[PDB]
Design a protein around this motif. Sequence first.
Motif: not given
Lengths: 496, 496, 496, 496
Positions: A22, A286, A290, C108-109, C316, C318
Amino acid sequence: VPDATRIGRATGAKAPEFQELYDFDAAALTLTSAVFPYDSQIHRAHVVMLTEQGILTVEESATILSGLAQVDELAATDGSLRTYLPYEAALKRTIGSVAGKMHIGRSRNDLANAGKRMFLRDQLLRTIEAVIGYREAVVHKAADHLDTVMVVYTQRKEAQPITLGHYLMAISENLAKNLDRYRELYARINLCPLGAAATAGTGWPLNRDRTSALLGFDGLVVNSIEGVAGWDHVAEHAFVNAVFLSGLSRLASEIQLWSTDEYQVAELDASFAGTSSIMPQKKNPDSLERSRKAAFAAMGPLVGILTSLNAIEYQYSAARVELEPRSIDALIAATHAMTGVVRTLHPNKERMRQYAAENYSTMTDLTDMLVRRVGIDYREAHEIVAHVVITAIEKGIKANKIGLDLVQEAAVAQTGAGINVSADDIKDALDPWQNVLRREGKGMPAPMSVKASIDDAMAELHKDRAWLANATQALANAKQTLADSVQQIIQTDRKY
Amino acid sequence: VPDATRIGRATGAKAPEFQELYDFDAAALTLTSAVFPYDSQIHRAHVVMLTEQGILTVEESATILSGLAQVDELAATDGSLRTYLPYEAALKRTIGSVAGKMHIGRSRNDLANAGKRMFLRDQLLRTIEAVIGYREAVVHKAADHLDTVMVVYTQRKEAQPITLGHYLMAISENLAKNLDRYRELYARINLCPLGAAATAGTGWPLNRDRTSALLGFDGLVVNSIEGVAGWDHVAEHAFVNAVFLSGLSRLASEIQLWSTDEYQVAELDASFAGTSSIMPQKKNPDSLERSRKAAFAAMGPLVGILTSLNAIEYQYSAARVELEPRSIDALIAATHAMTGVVRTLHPNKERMRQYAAENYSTMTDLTDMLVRRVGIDYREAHEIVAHVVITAIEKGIKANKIGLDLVQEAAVAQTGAGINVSADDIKDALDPWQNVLRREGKGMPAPMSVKASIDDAMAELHKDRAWLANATQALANAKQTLADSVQQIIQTDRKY
Amino acid sequence: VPDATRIGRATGAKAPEFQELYDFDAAALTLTSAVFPYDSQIHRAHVVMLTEQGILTVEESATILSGLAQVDELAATDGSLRTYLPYEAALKRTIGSVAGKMHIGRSRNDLANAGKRMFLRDQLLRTIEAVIGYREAVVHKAADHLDTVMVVYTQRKEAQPITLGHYLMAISENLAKNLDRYRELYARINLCPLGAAATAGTGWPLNRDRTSALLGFDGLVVNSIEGVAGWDHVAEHAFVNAVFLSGLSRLASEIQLWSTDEYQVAELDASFAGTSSIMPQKKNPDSLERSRKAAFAAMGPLVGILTSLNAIEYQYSAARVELEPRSIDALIAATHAMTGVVRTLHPNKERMRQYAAENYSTMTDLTDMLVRRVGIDYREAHEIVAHVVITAIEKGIKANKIGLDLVQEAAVAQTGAGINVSADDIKDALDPWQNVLRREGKGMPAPMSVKASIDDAMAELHKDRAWLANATQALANAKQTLADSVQQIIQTDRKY
Amino acid sequence: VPDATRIGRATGAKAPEFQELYDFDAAALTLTSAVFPYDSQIHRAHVVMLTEQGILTVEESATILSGLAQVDELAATDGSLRTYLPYEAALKRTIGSVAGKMHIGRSRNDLANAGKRMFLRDQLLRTIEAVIGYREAVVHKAADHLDTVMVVYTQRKEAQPITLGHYLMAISENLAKNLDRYRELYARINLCPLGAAATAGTGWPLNRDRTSALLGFDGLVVNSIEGVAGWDHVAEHAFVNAVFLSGLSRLASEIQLWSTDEYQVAELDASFAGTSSIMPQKKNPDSLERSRKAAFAAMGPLVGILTSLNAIEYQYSAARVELEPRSIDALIAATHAMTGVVRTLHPNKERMRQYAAENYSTMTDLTDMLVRRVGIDYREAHEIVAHVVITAIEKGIKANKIGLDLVQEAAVAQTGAGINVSADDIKDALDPWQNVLRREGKGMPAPMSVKASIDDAMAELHKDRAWLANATQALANAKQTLADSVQQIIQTDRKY
Ligand SMILES: NCCN[C@@H](CC(=O)O)C(=O)O
Ligand SMILES: NCCN[C@@H](CC(=O)O)C(=O)O
Ligand SMILES: NCCN[C@@H](CC(=O)O)C(=O)O
Ligand SMILES: NCCN[C@@H](CC(=O)O)C(=O)O
Ligand SMILES: O=C(O)/C=C/C(=O)O
Ligand SMILES: O=C(O)/C=C/C(=O)O
């Protein structure tokens, strides 16, 4: 104020490695900001060489050298002094016209090529360090899981029984060859182009070997055109980053399937997962997604760099695309994240075995057994065992419940013949742990075989660290040799 | 019927290397057609190993081995027999059920991985051979042009005087490091994955070292998952092809600018140029532009392969993109074309010198001379000589006509001071050949310096050929060892 | 302190458009920093809709709305408040637990998908504005150069006579279709995904059309999975950027060859060129080469985005790669730079004509004349005129000096026949301006024909501006409608 | 001889669409072979126009036209006659010197550009046809599954309840916008560059509108430089292929996870799956993985084409990369395969519901219910329901077994407060089918809402077919108009 994302099932704090994913984007330097400290090193090493060659007098030398220290300090806060000519001008305002003489026999072209090499050089060892730690966590995790029986997949379908240790040692072998790529890239990066000047060299009689040694290079980019026009090491650096990260994406994707609600053969440590602002049940990967994102993005620099080389002549050119700090920073963050994912991964040892014993990944050993015991050829046994599976599914019989009854039914219905095997032969052929132990050749999941993989990997890792330690110490020695050479010329003048 | 494109100024025939660029696309094999001969080699080596391990009896072995010869012959004309299971079925129709036993302890997955490795292995040496011949023609051309004075460019603007020999030795250094990349890739390709079977190995006690040795590999892909899921060597092969061809594109683009109607410092040999069907004056660089085309296209396989690895898990997978024969064939055609372009290139030695003497590429030596003679710093001398050029252009005075008058005018108009240099100092500073001779450091255009580059390159080329000769002989020895092992098992049975 | 790079022949200051190329990298926002103002707009429009639907009371609404204004102000300096959940938490600390209610029926999506769409939406009009100004400068430059005779090139070889105006109108037609691509992309970007929530919608009865209208969207992303998983508009935005910039690279490369020391048919304005720190003669195309650099780099985001979509499911995720602000900023800087390069470009009208008249680009009209006058077929006349050029070069006779003598020599030496044409027929066929005037069909270099191109382009440009003005006014109207809706709910509560 | 891969669980034959994936590579034409029929059409239309313009006499015209028919026949078997100049030469050998006159006012450059446009034009409609059939099968499948309750995923984790029909309509909306991209590309492809000749037009007074109309184009590429140098339509064609296939890869990957041994919420039809030569249990997604392979490979042409445009000037150039037939053929095979995968997909309706009811995807509705009934804000309810899930997992309680007891435990343990809801409120909130029915807004999984999606899609599909039918009929009409024009000139001469 806490981390507002640590709510619901996102308990505790993000692991630091998870947090890196992040932070790297907003914290990354520009290429100018990351390279300009290396330019100041080239200035010092370059005028030292000019002095030893009698191009500069010791008076001129010390005046310049001491001036560089002052401008470096101005540049720590003045952003405009981080490109050459503004920097040279500030030196002119600080020590007089003699400043101009630091550019004798030199160009911005070979200054830039050398400085960027020095930056990539350091970022390469930073990467090799991160890949080593990645491999360490991988091998170390394997060591603790020689008995963790689970299925391996091909085409995202359960294939045959293995162990988690066996799987992780595939990653170790992948990372070993990526470490080779990086070390082979290093030798092509760590060559000094200084002395090429604009592209054709200079009449001033420089000692190119001395500048190269003072700056830590292990050799010269000899031809002067190659010195300023050579860029393949940048392309190659982008490539290895992409190919290595593709292997990291594949592991992240593998663990993400393991940790699905449907597989649930593994679970991410709470410190490497997040959750939803709307759906309370989510334990989201996540960290994994990422990390994959960074791997996909790493193809960008690769393509941009190669497009740019394909678009020009074999000249110095300002149209070439660079490998940016933010790109390397993403790689590092992702390697660190996956290093911690592997270390803290929680395998559900029990459901792993359940799948291995119930979902028919043991049918190869059943087939091999028929061939080894009654001598029929593989293709015919295959058809028998295949129809065994077709039948077992229809009737709801899991693999570990398949009996002598069913194997005889299938052999008959498919050939008219029965087949000469006991209920013990079958039971043992369908035992997933026995599937593992029978696969004891080199590189196979048997504990004795994986432990041998681990023993060799530990020794290779020992050697990886030795190589890194030597390459780091070499640069530090040359950085100190240069610091001493400068002090001496500054002292020599002040005392005479 | 002649080549209908050889009309007008396209005199004579296309050089054979030039013709390759037109033939490779339609002549390239499919991957299946190019790999299936290597599969038959794996069959022979694999059942030989099965025999030496007592998994097959000598009777079974010889029956299979002799059957393979028959099916190989059927497959020379029957396209459908060039994938495994159709091939296995045809062997079943030819020698009976025993055919099935050649697949004991083996899968299509490790068969494919090994066979494709063998194909790329041979295509790699084919490439190293072509890159060597490319470097040979480049170095050899340089040797004949130590006195060919010409300008080097930066940013497509005349920079400083060099020689054509100096330029070509930049290419030699580029090609040396590309040969390193290929040799480093070879070591990662030439590892045997056979024994991995589907991905987890097998209970059958194979000798993985024996199969690997019989097929010419220099080592094992140890872990069985890495054996079928490893693909980085394919990505890397695509990369080196792209990075090497980018360097070839840049040379082709350089020569294309040299050979423009406006530069005309070089001319393509008639046998490497074409013409227009409408414009009779055209002498078109078809060889150069089709060579660049191949370099641009080589980024495709690279991107496709890496996208595919980024899209999967660390498993065997049928979704991975391959490096195709037609892609390698394009590279070979382009390397051959540029090998002949370099060899037969016709430099206009005279207009080369004219540019070097008239177009102000010698102003650096003028600047350096002021600094070396009156001691002013570089930045101030630069401004004097810069305004000299501004003035000389306004007044139409070419570089070699600039006199003491003009240098004093500029020094005065820019500083109020005159400057202490003779008309001889200036004349010599503006002599392009003297610019070359003064640049005598390592890697600079001075003949004594370029000849040293050439001497080292000749020795490296000697070593390149030695490496290639050794790698080729290794494969031929193992291919003969395997042929003898097969004959002996076929003879042993027939006589007992 | 002046610009230290404006020395020697780099006179005056960098043009502002040229300076942009040096500033955009360090000044570009992160994606988070660039999008978070659009999130606050979505918050306002989303709770307004919640209020009109009776999900929030007016008291709750006004409390939230007024709180957003306060947090927006905190976020102007607190970087941590620029992602959703930290922002929501700060609203909780500012107005109480009611803050939580702004997330009813939302995720949030779909917040991210909509906010990023709004950012790209504005950046798209910013781009269309820049491409219009690019086309304006191009067409306007053409208008001033209907008589500037010059050669057009094919394969970097002089082909046939044209005018600079004719050439620039090829760019205009290229830019027209790129403006079409951008307008077609806009319609796919400007669709609102809000209401999709996590991916499946919500039980809360939202009015999706009202939120969409309040935020300036022209329609809905209907299906809720498409709302959060749809990404093609990001890929497409990256593509058009790359394809458009490729056309800009080609122009920059064309002008860079024009402005070579060897061509010198054009010269960059001093304000768009730099110079060397070592070579005083250099007038370097830094503007052109840094514009090309941006075009090469634009392939990176394209590849990264498409790799990421190829690597996931239709969910969806990330792991998807974004189009970054810094990438768009580079495009804008390069478009602006080339807009000013075109405007201030200095063609050497005289050397342009010299080349057109002397370097044999007029041989097609000579060939066409033979065919039109004596009736021979094209292929035979071609061979005559081809040998005319071969002979003229050998003998040093420029095109405009070729006579009746030489045409008869060639016709005889190549056919044994003479040919029936006067010295006037030839002289006129070799006149470059007459070559231009004879090419008077649609899209050809004749002034009457290019002026017609310009007339149509001016009308299309008028329409381009109208489209842009309408799309901008639409967004401003909706941004005001939303500001008024908020004020009214804040006033309604305070007064009741 | 049967398909030797249809063994074990690979029952029956490969579906034809599945077989396409194995055939397209070996069957694809070269670009030369695929384009040369369109060149013959341009010859006919071009000399017809020459005749109507009085450049050719009717005698010359008919002689040429009839000759073309003969050479076309020779070219059906003689490969060498499929490039222009060999073809022109063969016409010379067949009808005499008049053959040469078919090239008046024309070049290979605009011939190639137009011919390749015609090829891509037809391949575009072939693609739009395949994408329509893909969308038809998708929408039609959705219609049959308005009640098939299942979970939707985000980040490969169960998110919320939906229906299979709802999911498939996300694909429909994706395909609708891809059909828009293709139709928008078509308008930029279907422009005629003929008349540009080499790049600058011609003195011969052609009617460019007549040639364009005769060949089916809907307009002109006006500027003559754009006519031969324009390539963006090739880049764009490669892009849409890649972006569309990325959406197809994502569906294939989604279904591949559905059909895992661990999910088993779906099963491929036997006719779209294969099996292993070693592992009898395998039912392998060969159709899916080879479809993804084609999507990854489609990024290659895209990158190669854009690299090539970035590498040149805005000229005609032979260095530009093409979109190859084999690339389009792969797309078609993959679209067809996935069209049949969707149609014949077998959802396990029952295990789908089990997951929706047991695996906590219904916790959002539980949270929303607390907010709607007792008025607490979302963030606090979220924490209650989150700890409910934490507790339920620890204790082994599936979602559909969660009671009033547990919700009160969590509300207390997390706030000290109980909460005012009945066991009926909870039971209904945890009912997956009730989750679906409550999501009844536009684009949400409620049957009434998905049926509305389907109704709009059916009408859009009707319009898609109308557009395709019109574009096909236009080309057929112009192809007949041209055939009649030729016959008439051949008849006119023979009878006079
Ligand atoms: N953890 C980031 C992914 N976004 C969540 C949704 C959300 O956070 O509103 C999810 O899909 O689980
Ligand atoms: N030599 C292939 C390039 N095409 C020619 C034109 C033509 O051949 O009609 C040219 O532009 O010179
Ligand atoms: N104007 C930036 C390019 N670098 C210069 C060299 C230099 O600035 O030292 C050149 O090659 O002209
Ligand atoms: N169906 C092609 C994939 N290869 C098989 C193995 C094999 O066919 O030997 C598998 O991994 O299932
Ligand atoms: O849902 C988000 O906006 C953040 C996702 C992540 O943490 O990666
Ligand atoms: O003009 C052509 O079609 C061929 C060009 C080439 O020979 O490369």
